[PDB]
Design a protein around this ligand. Structure first.
Ligand code: HEM
Ligand code: HEM
Ligand code: OUG
Ligand code: OUG
Ligand code: H4B
Ligand code: H4B
Ligand code: ZN
Lengths: 411, 409
């Protein structure tokens, strides 16, 4: 069965046959759309079908479907599952898996780059210290002195769920958030809960507005451990504005490497609960959400005041004005420092091309409009007028609960 | 299955039970979300359950559920259907139905005003001339000298689909769009085809940029007829900037009255194919969309030019910067001329409050995040961080094929 999408700006129509390869669920029914809901111990019984399905895909990609290489591998994985109740991925399989997880990530506007992922196999890792080492090397390789490279580091898969590897940080690099007694927050309000855990685990907090958080790392289901990323490895960019000289004086800076570390990579039924991945920022991620969200740094007012804007009535659109300037600054700062960044116009344009290419050579592209459209200036980017189909494919990146809610403490 | 929705900016959690009443379908499945798809004659037997459902909710709303009055009406409507193969709404049911179609319009951010709708019963209308009269009265009432008032005018219901009443215009008031020989487009590009149908029907185009289109009204499924709205009933706002003097020299204005006229209102199974309805603009509808969309006025570049912005790279965000100025101007102009308008911050804030109210007194509120989020400055408006459930309630407004595709000419 065919399914069609239309770009209402360009009248381009595309046909999705790939959605038929969709196994998982969306959360939607024929009577309800959960399209804007943020978030809507595995046995051998259901594992070999998930395995066979991955392997069939894999050997399809390398044009070896039904080959003896394919059949032997199936057999090999089978016997390993019925015997060991799990199985191991070959290096080739793991690399394929990681890339396609990204390719399948329907909420990711940056997926034009998916084929060029640097996959670091950390499956031999056994301790937090070993995790720390793998992560430093990720950060150094990915950062590349400001010339960012996509990378992911994959730690051992979950086994009985009692011996999980986890990076407790939501991102490898993020700034601390401190709740002051007076209710105000110093630092990043997003990170207050995690900051408190760190401090409790014995982190000595400098208590500044831009303190890089320590890595909190859990190996083999053991209590997590604190590590300080070496500062020379953390590339940061002071934020200034090209026309507004007082902007530097707001004292803002941001780190260069977006590296997400709390999601779960699923490949052929295997769950990799620690799998930090990194790319480079779209400017609005910092300038709109990080700085201007009401529940974050919320410097909109500060910027608006220094712009001497009419902050009395909202109909002056002073919020809108300040927001644009702040995003102008983020881009400007990053570009001046030769630190890789992409603006939301370039990135949405790229994604549209990616998406078309994907419909043509893959039969579709899962995409979550709610998430793909930029958090500012939506309709003047080309994805706003673009119809999209959302559906779940595997391999995939999944959400998982914060470890401090599920972890059994050793002591 | 008594679903929850979280606001991630406030942690407010609302419990939706209203969705379980939903009748129609979303277009989604467990395997695919179609939440970003623009667009996913009844028998004797289809019609009566539809009627009963409507009447049940009507008599529940007036706290006379299961009453003599209720049962009588149910009986009365039932009999009228069995014999006449349709039925007629009581005035009181007509008003309720209309008000609730707007209430249930999941894509509408302006629904906090839903119960203050002025309903105009035009079910006695028989001709296009009559339609023109009803529509002129609607426009004059709704406009109210700049102090806009919500209204709907309801023309006779469908019968056998051969005698449909239809307003061929998408909106009562819209600027013409002309295809220049050199290639591009003069006026309003969205209105290019309709502008031609009008000419192709005998309209004499002034071929200016802001030519108010004529009405093309169709009564009882006859050939449609051209009528010109008296210019004095069409309130327009000249667009100037509070800061930039050169702005007025762009020569821009917009009309005050948004009045959508191509949708179908469904109540208790009956189909009102002609039901123009109107309120007042959210600023972005004009400034973000009507002015700056590529397939529209696309004046962005021109504005940015006069602003002397670096239009060389996208990363200067000149489009964004200009976009914001244009929208400051629209609001400034409308407010200056005392023509009702709401900014996208105010309206979204109102909608959250409306959501609050609906979960509290109704148990929920169907909403389409994709359309409720304003086309600019999304995440700094409160609806962005607001989870919303989308489902189809009735009575409702629905899309319908453009008449020229259908009409037996
Ligand atoms: C290299 C340039 C990249 C850019 C510019 C980019 C951009 C983005 C943006 C803007 C979002 C929306 C998140 C938000 O706004 O809060 C997103 C989501 C996401 N990205 Fe990408 N990304 C890039 C690379 C990657 C890589 C390398 C991976 C993994 C290998 C990845 C995986 C994901 C996933 C899984 C999500 C959504 C998570 C979910 O489903 O909730 N991205 N990306
Ligand atoms: C009074 C002030 C009102 C405001 C500010 C308002 C605002 C809006 C906006 C911004 C949209 C998005 C459409 C677009 O962006 O092109 C919309 C859609 C819509 N409006 Fe409202 N509106 C108002 C009154 C009304 C009234 C009086 C009705 C009918 C009685 C109505 C019915 C609808 C419907 C049915 C849709 C979407 C149709 C669909 O579901 O596809 N609105 N409105
Ligand atoms: C790799 C990469 C690059 C980039 N530029 N942005 C990203 C954003 C996410 C993300 C996913 C879900 C929720 C959130 C909320 N902070 C962020 C994941 C990976 C990303
Ligand atoms: C009454 C009212 C006031 C207002 N301010 N905006 C409105 C927008 C629509 C609308 C609905 C679907 C599609 C489109 C695209 N032309 C527009 C309908 C009624 C409206
Ligand atoms: C493709 C997409 O669904 C389409 O452009 C929609 C998206 N959201 C919208 N939202 C509003 N308010 N108005 C619109 O016309 C649209 N267009
Ligand atoms: C409630 C809503 O689903 C939530 O705020 C989503 C909406 N769309 C988003 N889109 C992006 N890119 N990033 C986000 O964090 C969100 N948040
Ligand atoms: Zn859906």
């Amino acid at each position: 069965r065919f399914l069609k999408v239309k770009n209402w700006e360009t009248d381009v129509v595309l046909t999705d046959t790939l959605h038929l390869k969709s196994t998982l669920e969306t959360g939607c029914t024929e009577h309800i759309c959960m399209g804007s809901i943020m978030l809507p111990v595995r046995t051998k019984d259901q594992l070999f079908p998930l395995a066979k399905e991955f392997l069939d895909q894999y050997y399809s990609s390398i044009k070896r479907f039904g080959s003896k290489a394919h059949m032997d591998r199936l057999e090999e994985v089978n016997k390993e599952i019925e015997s060991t109740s799990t199985y191991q991925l070959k290096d080739t399989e793991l690399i394929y898996g990681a890339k396609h997880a990204w390719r399948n990530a329907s909420r990711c506007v940056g997926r034009i780059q998916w084929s060029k992922l640097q996959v670091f196999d950390a499956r031999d890792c056994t301790t937090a210290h070993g995790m720390f080492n793998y992560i430093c090397n990720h950060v150094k390789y990915a950062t590349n002195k400001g010339n960012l490279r996509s990378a992911i580091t994959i730690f051992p898969q979950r086994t009985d769920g009692k011996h999980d590897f986890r990076v407790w940080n939501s991102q490898l690099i993020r700034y601390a958030g401190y709740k002051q007694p007076d209710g105000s927050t110093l630092g990043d309000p997003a990170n207050v809960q995690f900051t408190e855990i760190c401090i409790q685990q014995g982190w000595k907090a400098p208590r500044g507005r831009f303190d890089v958080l320590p890595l909190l790392l859990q190996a083999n289901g053991n209590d997590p451990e604190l590590f300080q990323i070496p500062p020379e490895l953390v590339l940061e960019v002071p934020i200034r504005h090209p026309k507004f000289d007082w902007f530097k004086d707001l004292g803002l800076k941001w780190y260069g490497l977006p590296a997400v570390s709390n999601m779960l990579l699923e490949i052929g039924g295997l769950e990799f609960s620690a799998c930090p991945f990194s790319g480079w920022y779209m400017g609005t991620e910092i300038g709109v959400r990080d700085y201007c969200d009401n529940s974050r740094y919320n410097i909109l007012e500060e910027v608006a005041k220094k712009m001497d804007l009419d902050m009395r009535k909202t109909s002056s659109l002073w919020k809108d004005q300040a927001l644009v300037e702040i995003n102008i600054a983020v881009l400007y700062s990053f570009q001046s420092d030769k630190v890789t960044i992409v603006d939301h116009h370039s990135a949405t344009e790229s994604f549209i091309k990616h998406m078309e290419n994907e419909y043509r050579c893959r039969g579709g592209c899962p995409a979550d409009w709610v998430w793909i459209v930029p958090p500012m200036s939506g309709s003047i980017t080309p994805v706003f007028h673009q119809e999209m189909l959302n559906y779940r494919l595997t391999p995939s990146f999944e959400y998982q609960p914060d470890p401090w809610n599920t972890h059994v403490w050793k002591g």
